[PDB]
Amino acid sequence: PADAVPAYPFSLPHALDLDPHYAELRRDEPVSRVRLPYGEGTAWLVTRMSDARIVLGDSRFSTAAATDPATPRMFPTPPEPDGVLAQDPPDHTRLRRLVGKAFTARRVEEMRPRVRSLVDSLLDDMVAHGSPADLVEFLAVPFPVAVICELLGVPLEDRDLFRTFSDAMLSSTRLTAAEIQRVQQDFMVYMDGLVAQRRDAPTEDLLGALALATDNDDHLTKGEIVNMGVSLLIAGHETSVNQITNLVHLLLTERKRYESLVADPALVPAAVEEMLRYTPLVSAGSFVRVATEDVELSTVTVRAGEPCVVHFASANRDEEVFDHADELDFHRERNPHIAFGHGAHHCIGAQLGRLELQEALSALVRRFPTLDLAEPVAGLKWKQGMLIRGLERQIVSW
């Protein structure tokens, strides 16, 4: 009848806790029907790692199909069809070659000197201010912003402008479809004007390459190119901003974790990997994939036409994959998490986010051995109504 399929998300999120329903689903109903907050009909929620790798990793699932306004989705506005996430291979592959060179592990690693220099600079400004201080204001926000503005070639003077835009674009329930469609439109025209400036004066930056491509690639559309600029500018700071605060929260609320990194700072890369695994940065669900053919998952054959949604954080707690999966452990031998997704849409910024997180924690644990949270855990201002989780403020002392 009117379905008794449960609403997803199941609940408003609490700090970085996973809803307890996911462990129940993994063990007893790993693929299950749900109703998403927008779109029509139902979708399969996938909570286990092997199923997640098939949904994310197989041509028989299409994200392009999900651009239909009737397809279930986690966000109010229908997906933009020229957005990178809504492309299927091989069209997706051609689109990613627009920018991909700049994001290889090799080119990102070459940014470490520049990136460390910027971190130290912001922590200089924090030490000037004096303890206590808001870590979000002095580190979590300015640091990513500066990295992505250098790489893209966005002016740092526009931070306030494009952070308003990005916050709205990451709305889950916080903003309505209309408000988000207006911001979408404004961000588009803004990005298009940044790229259009390179047309009489090319720059050695990503926006530079974007502008060369609008002239010399008769297989890429200006809509796709400009949307790539917009996507990179959003994901390129909003993820790491949140993840810096999230990692710091995990470290300070069981100080032993932080103390182990203070004692041994070369453990930081591994810790970053383990906290990526453990942190439900993506608040709930994922970009929907629609089966274009019947596909076998662990417990169910998804029919052609049926949508699916992966919960990344749930797959990252799969007990068949990780030992003591509900525990945070910086000395795991194996960590095949999907905090950065999997398959064709594997995060393009994965190496850059790793670099940023490593340089931010490494600097903290070496310079601020005495760092602690200097506001009550009860009052922490968790962002509400967004597709990702993180803190609006994090006052710390040292």
Ligand code: HEM
């Ligand atoms: C640690 C921080 C980050 C996390 C946890 C993260 C997580 C993810 C995840 C899970 C996906 C897959 C979404 C899906 O397939 O449904 C993804 C895709 C993506 N991420 Fe990231 N990301 C991070 C940092 C970044 C950065 C720094 C950038 C840009 C420089 C970026 C840009 C993207 C883009 C463009 C995609 C879409 C890729 C595609 O469709 O081909 N992300 N990210």
Ligand SMILES: C[C@]12CC[C@H]3[C@@H](CCC4=CC(=O)CC[C@@]43C)[C@@H]1CC[C@@H]2O
């Ligand atoms: C930025 C972006 C929208 C927000 C996405 C981001 C990929 C990673 C991610 C995971 C989600 O499930 C939604 C929020 C985010 C953070 C997307 C890449 C392109 C798209 O425009």
Ligand code: NA
């Ligand atoms: Na979607």
